[PDB]
């Protein structure tokens, strides 16, 4: 009976040092029933998961920046960062399948993040294909990507579906938050509304079930928005009543005492279900992170923690230049093994085009010459995109075109280009 | 007869200073027969063509940069550039509906170009919604976009469809080139192939017909890659026979004598069927542009020209600081009223992120600080995206939410945000 | 300061027979503040809106079927139906931008509906382009489409965005229903959850404010699932308190007294905020729809109703042939001016393909030739797709190529075709 | 090296009974150089191509229908067809990412075809998912898909790129035709233009290289339109000169003597670089088919052929009902192991909706109840889609939902649904 052999193999897989901490309130029987008859392979997802787990257990910490194009993810890997962050904020702003500029209010189409992850993996694969074609070895391009699944884009089935989509697109890891989908909001926005703790756990179980049904040890990050969230949908859950002042808004939200206490309560509740815990934060406060991490290690020794080094903070207002300089080392040492500047891509794209565009209006081609000279200078450090035809794969596609002809083509592109003759 | 007015009203619109020197080898009765029973209204396109036309005549010249995201487009407009360039090179590298990193060899889906125009206009539309709600109006958001139609992605029927798609999306001008569509290549790549003059003209006719059928006076830009391309597909056209050496390649291609000679032949053929002539060039050489300008102006005095200040040139290697600085004034004088840096969008993005990522790898939040610190300094020039919640409409959608609510609303986004607290 | 002229124009358009007894809890100045500098024209939306309203005021009733491709819509208009239904259920199952087969649980991307409207309006537009070129005009092609906006896919902001999307696509009417977005099911599935009355009203205001913002009088259709829904998110609304039992579920949902009385409570609550009321129903019961009409008209005389002649009912099981044959004429007398078979596309498509497939396995082209004959015979009833090159516009694009070629062209498609030879 | 060992794995995988008599004008080392550093698994494409090969070699022949929705493909598999045809034509008319209705004139976005293969595999994945959850085995859902790549949509790299696209979407075979890509049109349209035989060969080689790089034995079908095509781009190939009259068109096309001898010249040139050969024909003439099967097998013994049972033929005009009944049986014994009704999807869809729309326009719900009854009748033969909630996976998701809850759930959809009361 290969039914009983398959369920056997599911079970053995579940019972390894990965998953040591974690609870699955479903049998292997259940996963078997719901995964169909043919097990599809998700190479980039599996590789990304295994590589992210190992980095997280073998590095001081993993520091990322959000990317909203493949070209950005590419230059992040070229610089030597070992993981890539997929910001829903950045997706709303400038990269969704509605083609709109959106504030972080869950207004964009739900397949936007997965498609971007798929685009980022595609850029990374072309980089690798190009490097491989030149017999280079100096970069491992399949950087784990950690993706924003917001509040699930609805109910647990919506969670289940987006988890599967992120895996198909090949994400190493996926974060889910405890906000009301109908009213999801940026973590550094007012008006945040919590769901019942049991609600947030159902969401996390749907993540893991999805991941199991795809047969990938995708990393589940449980985020909580409870440190600032002074609104709750329902007082039904015994764990949430203690935080309810017993008053109610004209929409019938329950008012709650937000602060590290409600953040810790949610963190503790979610941690048997999550590979990593994320506590949204009003400011960069190394002390608040020490107390949050202390609280969580108190009952969950060595549980991975992630920290948002948000551009949503005015860093040099909240902190002296020495503390900033040490911030990621300090967060490192408390257990925050994954740290990510969420809106790095937006700020990098918007500021960089503003400075070029404004100098261009003023000084025309002087502005562009200066950028091209900055790009040449940066070649000493790894940068190469100044040679933009090679950068995007004109080299690679020329070699394809030559294998297809047999050496006899008058239409080789990189040969006789301004790139080969002026750089 | 209501039909007779419609056929009269088309004709009247053709017989205006807008179409002063340009030939339509088809009749008002034709446009009528092909345009359906209902006149659909393309506001963004009409506005853009009318303003692109008025600007190219009023202003000394109009310099633009390539946008590949809505955000790049909008920061170009905020920095006071009066028009946006849509590079297909850029669509191919990092912004196409296949989600692939591609060289400039028409590998991406043909609807990628227009989807991006819509996306950009969606962003300028949200910027305009924002400024309007705030009673500001110190900026004109609806900058006209000039878009890459490459070589029409195939036959004249393809040219027809991609022009309509671009007008639907709100392009002000579209540019077609005279490369073989199966073998289309960056203009600065080797191994480019010409179609005959009559085929190149069929494409520009199909493009005006598209525009006449939609009822919009869209600027038509005709590009010649003949300045460098030494391959041609047919010896069929009288005007081209003079350039064929007599050699033929193993593929079939007729070899031709490239040079300013061929470009002038092509430009002069195209000039009566286009609004603006763009001679692709292999170095940023002003005498070459002067020679070309006077050649067209000899026959077509006051005909509009376009110069691609290509990042595919190495400006300091090829020019002294004085020329670079004066380059665009020079071109404007010669009659080049639209000057564009095609790959600006690409190099801003890649350079900016390689530089943030690299500094961030060594120095953690100290690097991100310097970007935030620079973003604040940039406000002296009119940069605002440092306050990123407001930049992308958080404030606009609050107003909408409060109007929907009466005013009784607890889930407002911007009030209570770290953005109001710390900025 | 032409502000005051523009605000006056907004106000006047609101005091017309259209929008008689239609409540807007907002001012013309609010609309002015949100709509932006510039007023983009939505020709199909305007036409469709204006036409659908006239049709509901001059016809015994409009009876329509569900469409999930252009071709389907196209043949519905060819058959003489005057309007088109866009089913979210059908989007779910076989026409969504995730390209997944889903049950009706809002598991698909929220832009799938508006995309499908654009595609239909495209097919219809080409049908029109063809007929116009051939000089025919026995069909008016611009049958208004009524589109499913489910429960807004989230909050009032989610509603406002999806309305505007539908208006860009060219919908005449959009329905919203009073289920929770995260728990949205098919109205004939079990375990539906209502939101509070004040919540549904906010969604219907967001809808209108979207329409006002876009200068288009789009039909708004408030749906209620309160006839069958035994759950509710919150007892906050004074108006809902009567229906609550006081039991709450293990998830916190308040049990309520599902039935025509709740359906009626919601209908009367929504009626002043929508042009059309639709009471979902669990069997085709004329007496039921009589009660419901009497109740609404009791307090809102004239109010247009809409009825789902759902395929989710077994029509033979529930009704004799006499009533089935009378059903739509009876509803029309009651004020159900828009009646629609939601899953007509689904059953037509799956049945037809299964039957062809089943026969083709056993009998090969013997089976296909029966269909091919069935199709010729259908020419008695007005079918023409049997000649499938002319059906999709081979002739029309041939007319375009000729105009382009100046009559020339040795590549015409329909000259030489097996269609001219064999049909 | 591990390099030499990977190069070998490639070399060994070619040196097998598949690839039989198949020339690659490149080395395993070439595939290694271009394939990047990781090799991604492609389960559906590998299963599809292994199964297709196996069917084509063990069944008397495979007969398949066109499909333009997953639902159409679903039902094709359920009625018991062993394979699915993806038709570029159908994609043009009612299934393209332009959302346009198009004639078969290569006017749609190239990734349309691959996007539709994804959707269909998804549909079959959810059917399989359902049948597993109900513990059924009677149907094998993973029916191989044969998809249209037209003329590669451009140069050989466009062929490279769409072949990959088709593989990562899970296509089992892809077909390529020797018409000029910019003038590409229906096999049964006039005005077809041939590319040189050397160029047809590059496109096939491009196809094999893509499949080899993704490491999947995708079935390549070479198609020729040289039976009817009387135009050619270049008289350059020495195999093509014989058929040149020496006349030229104004466009510069070479007139050629079209017919079975030209199609046999193309078939014999292409045979060594394809697994299966396809001669496009103007009528369902069994003699023509024997003369082709013969010409080809004379030099390429046991070469698989494909036949288009085209709906572009008026079947009962050209043949007696005796010959029609026996048509696929005969073609089979001649060696035509793949036989497909290209446009079955279009005809099934347009017929069934026109018929219902017309009946519904006259007799209202009497018309719909006749279809539903016709649907119930069909259950005798395996149809089940009349219970439409179970068909699209409401049951499957109810089980997912119940495993996430652990049995404490009041929002189960089939529980209390009209489907479970009336069916
Ligand atoms: Mn987020
Ligand atoms: Mn280009
Ligand atoms: Mn629905
Ligand atoms: Mn085809």
XYZ file of N, CA and C in Angstrom, chain C residues 102-274:
519
model
N -11.690 27.843 -9.051
C -12.051 28.081 -7.630
C -13.564 28.039 -7.411
N -14.039 27.542 -6.243
C -15.417 27.790 -5.811
C -15.633 29.264 -5.431
N -16.902 29.669 -5.313
C -17.312 31.083 -5.094
C -17.083 31.503 -3.632
N -15.804 31.705 -3.239
C -15.311 32.027 -1.863
C -14.302 33.192 -1.884
N -14.470 34.128 -2.817
C -13.516 35.229 -3.112
C -12.059 34.756 -2.969
N -11.656 33.741 -3.747
C -10.283 33.180 -3.723
C -9.477 33.682 -4.916
N -10.117 34.350 -5.866
C -9.475 34.877 -7.095
C -9.098 36.351 -6.910
N -8.099 36.841 -7.698
C -7.736 38.265 -7.758
C -8.894 39.208 -8.120
N -8.996 40.316 -7.384
C -10.128 41.257 -7.405
C -10.222 42.022 -8.723
N -9.184 42.010 -9.580
C -9.242 42.723 -10.888
C -9.717 41.770 -11.992
N -10.001 40.522 -11.681
C -10.492 39.576 -12.701
C -11.840 40.055 -13.267
N -12.766 40.482 -12.422
C -14.088 40.944 -12.890
C -13.996 42.087 -13.903
N -13.389 43.234 -13.524
C -13.227 44.362 -14.436
C -12.450 44.010 -15.708
N -11.434 43.153 -15.618
C -10.675 42.690 -16.807
C -11.690 42.044 -17.763
N -12.499 41.091 -17.281
C -13.471 40.321 -18.103
C -14.485 41.277 -18.736
N -14.942 42.297 -18.016
C -15.784 43.376 -18.613
C -15.019 44.024 -19.781
N -13.774 44.481 -19.609
C -12.975 45.085 -20.717
C -12.952 44.147 -21.947
N -12.658 42.846 -21.768
C -12.580 41.811 -22.838
C -13.908 41.709 -23.592
N -15.023 41.701 -22.860
C -16.387 41.560 -23.435
C -16.668 42.798 -24.290
N -16.582 43.959 -23.662
C -16.663 45.264 -24.352
C -15.705 45.287 -25.559
N -14.499 44.724 -25.474
C -13.605 44.588 -26.662
C -14.310 43.717 -27.739
N -14.682 42.472 -27.429
C -15.356 41.578 -28.392
C -16.543 42.320 -29.034
N -17.387 42.923 -28.204
C -18.591 43.642 -28.669
C -18.206 44.789 -29.620
N -17.202 45.574 -29.243
C -16.596 46.663 -30.061
C -16.152 46.173 -31.456
N -15.557 44.978 -31.544
C -15.049 44.402 -32.810
C -16.263 43.927 -33.610
N -17.218 43.286 -32.939
C -18.504 42.898 -33.561
C -19.081 44.139 -34.236
N -19.125 45.243 -33.499
C -19.581 46.553 -34.011
C -18.670 47.015 -35.166
N -17.338 46.915 -35.044
C -16.368 47.402 -36.074
C -16.622 46.670 -37.397
N -16.763 45.344 -37.327
C -17.141 44.438 -38.456
C -18.449 44.897 -39.116
N -19.582 44.868 -38.395
C -20.933 45.293 -38.883
C -20.838 46.682 -39.540
N -20.191 47.643 -38.886
C -20.039 49.015 -39.418
C -19.307 48.975 -40.756
N -18.247 48.185 -40.900
C -17.441 48.138 -42.151
C -18.296 47.544 -43.268
N -19.081 46.509 -42.957
C -19.997 45.796 -43.884
C -21.255 46.645 -44.157
N -21.406 47.800 -43.500
C -22.566 48.704 -43.663
C -23.851 48.187 -43.026
N -23.872 46.971 -42.484
C -25.008 46.451 -41.672
C -25.242 47.356 -40.446
N -26.455 47.333 -39.862
C -26.767 47.737 -38.450
C -28.175 47.258 -38.023
N -28.395 45.934 -38.063
C -29.572 45.227 -37.470
C -29.385 44.930 -35.959
N -28.156 44.836 -35.433
C -27.908 44.651 -33.972
C -27.278 45.923 -33.423
N -27.703 46.374 -32.241
C -26.950 47.348 -31.400
C -26.066 46.553 -30.403
N -24.748 46.741 -30.492
C -23.785 45.766 -29.916
C -23.487 46.100 -28.462
N -23.781 47.323 -28.042
C -23.237 47.885 -26.784
C -24.252 47.574 -25.686
N -24.692 46.324 -25.660
C -25.541 45.790 -24.582
C -24.834 46.117 -23.282
N -25.487 46.861 -22.396
C -24.882 47.154 -21.112
C -24.606 45.839 -20.372
N -23.498 45.803 -19.632
C -23.054 44.667 -18.774
C -23.307 45.033 -17.315
N -23.879 44.110 -16.544
C -24.005 44.248 -15.067
C -23.005 43.295 -14.417
N -22.132 43.846 -13.577
C -20.942 43.172 -13.004
C -21.041 42.961 -11.481
N -20.600 41.776 -11.038
C -20.458 41.300 -9.629
C -19.190 41.945 -9.043
N -19.366 42.809 -8.046
C -18.274 43.369 -7.223
C -18.236 42.657 -5.859
N -18.760 41.429 -5.806
C -18.815 40.543 -4.612
C -19.166 41.419 -3.400
N -18.368 41.417 -2.334
C -18.575 42.278 -1.147
C -17.532 43.390 -1.133
N -17.134 43.902 -2.293
C -16.099 44.947 -2.375
C -14.678 44.415 -2.218
N -14.481 43.111 -2.018
C -13.146 42.497 -1.744
C -12.466 43.222 -0.582
N -13.244 43.697 0.386
C -12.643 44.296 1.579
C -13.479 45.426 2.087
N -12.835 46.543 2.435
C -13.480 47.690 3.090
C -14.020 48.681 2.079
N -14.571 49.801 2.555
C -15.116 50.812 1.660
C -14.103 51.325 0.616
N -12.811 51.419 0.970
C -11.730 51.807 0.029
C -11.614 50.741 -1.067
N -11.631 49.475 -0.666
C -11.668 48.321 -1.599
C -12.878 48.442 -2.535
N -14.029 48.872 -2.030
C -15.270 49.051 -2.839
C -15.045 50.157 -3.866
N -14.604 51.317 -3.410
C -14.376 52.542 -4.225
C -13.439 52.247 -5.422
N -12.302 51.582 -5.158
C -11.334 51.159 -6.200
C -12.010 50.221 -7.203
N -12.737 49.190 -6.742
C -13.293 48.162 -7.677
C -14.445 48.761 -8.499
N -15.176 49.733 -7.949
C -16.226 50.433 -8.723
C -15.530 51.134 -9.871
N -14.484 51.885 -9.547
C -13.829 52.747 -10.557
C -13.246 51.859 -11.655
N -12.651 50.736 -11.264
C -12.121 49.709 -12.189
C -13.230 49.302 -13.164
N -14.411 48.922 -12.659
C -15.571 48.449 -13.475
C -15.993 49.550 -14.471
N -15.943 50.798 -14.011
C -16.249 51.990 -14.843
C -15.172 52.120 -15.937
N -13.881 52.023 -15.620
C -12.824 51.960 -16.672
C -13.150 50.833 -17.682
N -13.586 49.658 -17.236
C -13.810 48.474 -18.099
C -15.023 48.711 -19.004
N -16.024 49.453 -18.517
C -17.228 49.835 -19.290
C -18.500 49.160 -18.801
N -18.593 48.812 -17.517
C -19.838 48.301 -16.901
C -20.880 49.428 -16.798
N -22.155 49.059 -16.895
C -23.331 49.957 -16.754
C -23.884 49.876 -15.331
N -23.773 48.689 -14.742
C -24.242 48.416 -13.382
C -23.283 47.503 -12.664
N -23.199 47.696 -11.361
C -22.341 46.885 -10.469
C -23.172 46.513 -9.244
N -23.150 45.244 -8.831
C -23.791 44.836 -7.556
C -22.728 44.688 -6.454
N -23.114 45.086 -5.237
C -22.440 44.793 -3.947
C -23.448 44.131 -2.992
N -22.996 43.147 -2.208
C -23.795 42.353 -1.233
C -23.227 42.499 0.175
N -24.012 42.116 1.181
C -23.827 42.504 2.598
C -23.204 41.351 3.392
N -22.394 40.506 2.746
C -21.553 39.467 3.403
C -20.183 40.052 3.783
N -19.523 39.492 4.802
C -18.104 39.766 5.175
C -17.137 39.339 4.055
N -16.242 40.227 3.627
C -15.344 39.974 2.475
C -14.512 38.720 2.728
N -14.048 38.486 3.961
C -13.139 37.354 4.316
C -13.918 36.032 4.387
N -15.252 36.068 4.323
C -16.123 34.873 4.502
C -17.168 34.832 3.382
N -16.923 35.601 2.317
C -17.860 35.747 1.178
C -17.999 34.370 0.549
N -19.220 33.868 0.416
C -19.533 32.577 -0.240
C -20.556 32.893 -1.323
N -20.813 31.904 -2.181
C -21.979 31.862 -3.093
C -23.263 31.978 -2.265
N -24.209 32.785 -2.740
C -25.486 33.055 -2.067
C -26.354 31.817 -1.985
N -25.931 30.678 -2.531
C -26.676 29.394 -2.445
C -25.764 28.331 -1.809
N -24.714 28.770 -1.136
C -23.859 27.919 -0.279
C -24.345 28.124 1.153
N -24.012 27.224 2.072
C -24.291 27.432 3.501
C -23.243 28.342 4.112
N -23.476 28.793 5.350
C -22.435 29.399 6.194
C -21.983 30.756 5.683
N -22.922 31.560 5.199
C -22.696 32.983 4.867
C -22.740 33.802 6.163
N -22.011 34.916 6.195
C -21.932 35.848 7.356
C -22.296 37.260 6.884
N -23.318 37.891 7.457
C -23.631 39.312 7.174
C -22.648 40.215 7.920
N -22.429 41.415 7.376
C -21.868 42.596 8.082
C -23.061 43.379 8.616
N -22.837 44.337 9.532
C -23.879 45.250 9.971
C -24.442 46.160 8.885
N -25.711 46.487 9.023
C -26.417 47.421 8.118
C -25.536 48.657 7.858
N -25.047 49.331 8.898
C -24.259 50.585 8.740
C -23.022 50.288 7.863
N -22.515 49.056 7.907
C -21.351 48.612 7.115
C -21.740 48.488 5.637
N -22.805 47.757 5.334
C -23.349 47.665 3.963
C -23.670 49.052 3.400
N -24.229 49.955 4.200
C -24.567 51.334 3.733
C -23.248 52.043 3.356
N -22.219 51.998 4.222
C -20.892 52.597 3.910
C -20.411 52.072 2.536
N -20.541 50.766 2.278
C -20.095 50.163 0.994
C -20.917 50.738 -0.172
N -22.203 51.004 0.026
C -23.056 51.522 -1.068
C -22.733 53.002 -1.275
N -22.256 53.676 -0.239
C -21.880 55.108 -0.391
C -20.560 55.145 -1.176
N -19.567 54.377 -0.725
C -18.268 54.235 -1.419
C -18.540 53.996 -2.902
N -19.463 53.105 -3.216
C -19.833 52.810 -4.613
C -20.267 54.106 -5.300
N -21.326 54.758 -4.833
C -21.786 56.028 -5.460
C -20.627 57.028 -5.546
N -19.827 57.171 -4.485
C -18.830 58.269 -4.444
C -17.792 57.996 -5.517
N -17.462 56.725 -5.755
C -16.620 56.287 -6.887
C -17.247 56.807 -8.191
N -18.514 56.453 -8.439
C -19.289 56.853 -9.640
C -19.275 58.378 -9.783
N -19.588 59.095 -8.706
C -19.643 60.573 -8.753
C -18.242 61.019 -9.145
N -17.240 60.461 -8.497
C -15.833 60.891 -8.696
C -15.460 60.745 -10.183
N -16.038 59.775 -10.891
C -15.692 59.443 -12.300
C -16.702 60.055 -13.282
N -17.617 60.888 -12.812
C -18.593 61.579 -13.677
C -19.460 60.615 -14.476
N -19.920 59.525 -13.883
C -20.718 58.506 -14.626
C -21.848 57.975 -13.742
N -23.090 57.891 -14.276
C -24.268 57.510 -13.489
C -24.533 55.995 -13.472
N -23.502 55.221 -13.189
C -23.518 53.746 -13.116
C -24.643 53.243 -12.212
N -25.465 52.333 -12.704
C -26.518 51.665 -11.885
C -25.821 51.029 -10.681
N -26.273 51.336 -9.472
C -25.836 50.586 -8.260
C -26.944 49.625 -7.810
N -26.523 48.393 -7.560
C -27.368 47.231 -7.182
C -26.853 46.780 -5.821
N -27.602 47.074 -4.762
C -27.401 46.503 -3.409
C -28.114 45.160 -3.352
N -27.313 44.114 -3.207
C -27.716 42.725 -2.882
C -27.805 42.512 -1.363
N -28.762 41.691 -0.921
C -28.748 41.109 0.444
C -28.817 39.575 0.429
N -27.949 38.967 1.234
C -27.904 37.508 1.526
C -28.528 37.188 2.902
N -29.335 38.114 3.428
C -29.912 38.100 4.787
C -31.077 37.106 4.903
N -31.625 36.670 3.770
C -32.740 35.691 3.722
C -32.233 34.355 4.264
N -30.986 33.996 3.956
C -30.392 32.676 4.271
C -29.249 32.804 5.278
N -28.710 33.992 5.528
C -27.547 34.139 6.440
C -27.992 34.113 7.917
N -27.475 33.128 8.658
C -27.738 32.895 10.099
C -26.549 33.395 10.929
N -25.576 34.097 10.341
C -24.425 34.679 11.088
C -24.223 36.149 10.706
N -23.461 36.855 11.539
C -23.343 38.338 11.597
C -22.110 38.667 12.447
N -21.342 39.659 12.011
C -19.996 39.922 12.562
C -20.160 40.663 13.883
N -21.200 41.488 14.017
C -21.346 42.430 15.154
C -22.802 42.860 15.345
N -23.208 42.917 16.629
C -24.560 43.315 17.114
C -24.570 44.818 17.390
N -23.622 45.561 16.805
C -23.417 47.030 17.020
C -24.610 47.803 16.445
N -25.219 47.343 15.351
C -26.307 48.109 14.697
C -27.614 47.858 15.464
N -28.164 48.937 16.030
C -29.526 48.999 16.622
C -30.471 48.164 15.732
N -30.344 48.267 14.403
C -31.317 47.741 13.403
C -31.225 46.216 13.281
N -30.060 45.653 13.618
C -29.764 44.209 13.455
C -30.081 43.494 14.767
N -29.957 44.207 15.896
C -30.174 43.674 17.272
C -31.435 42.825 17.311
N -32.615 43.308 16.877
C -33.795 42.436 16.813
C -33.554 41.036 16.211
N -32.770 40.874 15.139
C -32.619 39.541 14.489
C -31.654 38.653 15.277
N -30.719 39.197 16.071
C -29.768 38.342 16.845
C -30.520 37.455 17.848
N -30.114 36.199 17.974
C -30.667 35.276 18.987
C -30.012 35.639 20.312
N -28.740 36.028 20.318
C -27.972 36.100 21.572
C -26.976 34.952 21.659
N -27.222 33.797 21.028
C -26.120 32.819 20.815
C -25.027 33.525 19.997
N -23.785 33.086 20.213
C -22.578 33.423 19.418
C -21.856 32.126 19.082
N -21.199 32.038 17.922
C -20.448 30.831 17.481
C -19.106 30.770 18.226
N -18.404 29.627 18.147
C -17.026 29.448 18.690
C -16.037 30.461 18.082
N -16.329 31.055 16.929
C -15.456 32.082 16.298
C -15.925 33.480 16.704
N -17.075 33.617 17.376
C -17.604 34.915 17.854
C -18.780 35.450 17.030
N -19.083 34.853 15.876
C -20.165 35.339 14.986
C -21.472 35.263 15.773
N -22.288 36.301 15.721
C -23.625 36.311 16.344
C -24.606 35.570 15.438
N -25.269 34.516 15.922
C -26.405 33.881 15.180
C -27.538 34.920 15.044
N -28.176 34.961 13.860
C -29.345 35.829 13.512
C -30.461 35.006 12.837
N -31.632 35.613 12.776
C -32.901 34.992 12.358
C -33.068 35.207 10.859
N -32.286 34.456 10.097
C -32.364 34.379 8.625
C -33.829 34.221 8.179
N -34.220 34.979 7.172
C -35.560 34.899 6.593
C -35.931 36.199 5.925
N -37.065 36.162 5.239
C -37.511 37.269 4.382
C -37.657 38.534 5.235
N -37.814 38.413 6.544
C -37.974 39.630 7.380
C -36.629 40.377 7.446
N -35.500 39.682 7.688
C -34.103 40.242 7.661
C -33.789 40.788 6.246
N -34.012 39.972 5.210
C -33.877 40.383 3.793
C -34.568 41.746 3.593
N -35.766 41.895 4.171
C -36.624 43.098 3.986
C -36.034 44.238 4.812
N -35.473 43.940 5.975
C -34.904 44.954 6.886
C -33.751 45.628 6.154
N -32.924 44.803 5.520
C -31.733 45.249 4.750
C -32.173 45.997 3.482
N -33.025 45.386 2.653
C -33.610 46.030 1.462
C -34.099 47.463 1.729
N -34.888 47.690 2.790
C -35.457 49.024 3.155
C -34.336 49.955 3.635
N -33.323 49.386 4.300
C -32.138 50.115 4.803
C -31.275 50.606 3.632
N -31.119 49.776 2.578
C -30.202 50.032 1.436
C -30.922 50.875 0.384
N -32.226 50.655 0.244
C -33.059 51.179 -0.863
C -32.712 52.631 -1.169
N -32.635 53.559 -0.188
C -32.332 54.965 -0.501
C -30.904 55.280 -1.010
N -30.031 54.261 -1.072
C -28.574 54.347 -1.352
C -28.170 53.519 -2.585
N -29.160 53.008 -3.329
C -28.977 52.158 -4.532
C -30.178 52.301 -5.478
